[PDB]
Design a protein around this ligand. Structure first.
Ligand code: 8DG
Ligand code: NA
Ligand code: NA
Length: 156
């Protein structure tokens, strides 16, 4: 089995809109996504999620709620990406374009699935329904899913 590297993903989800960022470079460039990145040495996963939100979007939040976990495997890459997914409804500040991301709000009847990672079509609806989830997706390149597992859980 492969080793895994810890990542976070943060979704700012208000009652009628969600904040996403257009990834301007790096992994997932050209796709709308939540905010996140690698967890660093000695920080808790939640604190790494708060840090990444602030670094990429300029937003601070006092607390985050863990909503899911997704493991990503890419053909031809030796490590798994273990993504810990968090949500908040309560933000401080206005989003700021960073080098990584251009933030934009989307109404919840206009979730830009065609411009998001393909797996998001599977798990994002669960997030909207307040259902915690564990997932795993194997990709060949950026577009093609070869295998995946998704399950609702009571405890993330
Ligand atoms: N929505 C979604 N997010 C994903 C998928 N795969 C995946 O790694 N992510 C998230 C986890 C992280 O938020 C981000 C990947 O982290 P990153 O490469 O931006 O990390 P970083 O900020 O530390 O990278 P860098 O600035 O050092 O280049 O994408 C996916 O299929 N769907
Ligand atoms: Na980052
Ligand atoms: Na990032």
């Amino acid at each position: 089995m492969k080793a895994s590297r810890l990542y976070t993903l943060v979704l700012v989800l208000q009652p009628q809109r969600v904040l996403l960022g257009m990834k301007k470079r790096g992994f997932g460039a050209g796709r709308w996504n939540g905010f996140g990145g690698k967890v660093q040495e000695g920080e808790t996963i939640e604190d790494g999620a708060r840090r990444e939100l602030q670094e990429e979007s300029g937003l601070t939040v006092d607390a985050l709620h863990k909503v899911g976990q997704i493991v990503f495997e890419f053909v031809g890459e030796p490590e798994l990406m273990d993504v810990h997914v968090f949500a908040t409804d309560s933000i401080q500040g206005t989003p700021v374009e960073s080098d990584e991301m251009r933030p934009s709000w989307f109404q919840l009847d206009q979730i830009p699935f065609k411009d998001m990672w393909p797996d998001d079509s599977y798990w994002f609806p669960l997030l909207l329904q307040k259902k915690k989830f564990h997932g795993y997706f194997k990709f060949q390149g950026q577009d093609t899913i070869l295998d995946y597992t998704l399950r609702e859980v009571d405890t993330v």
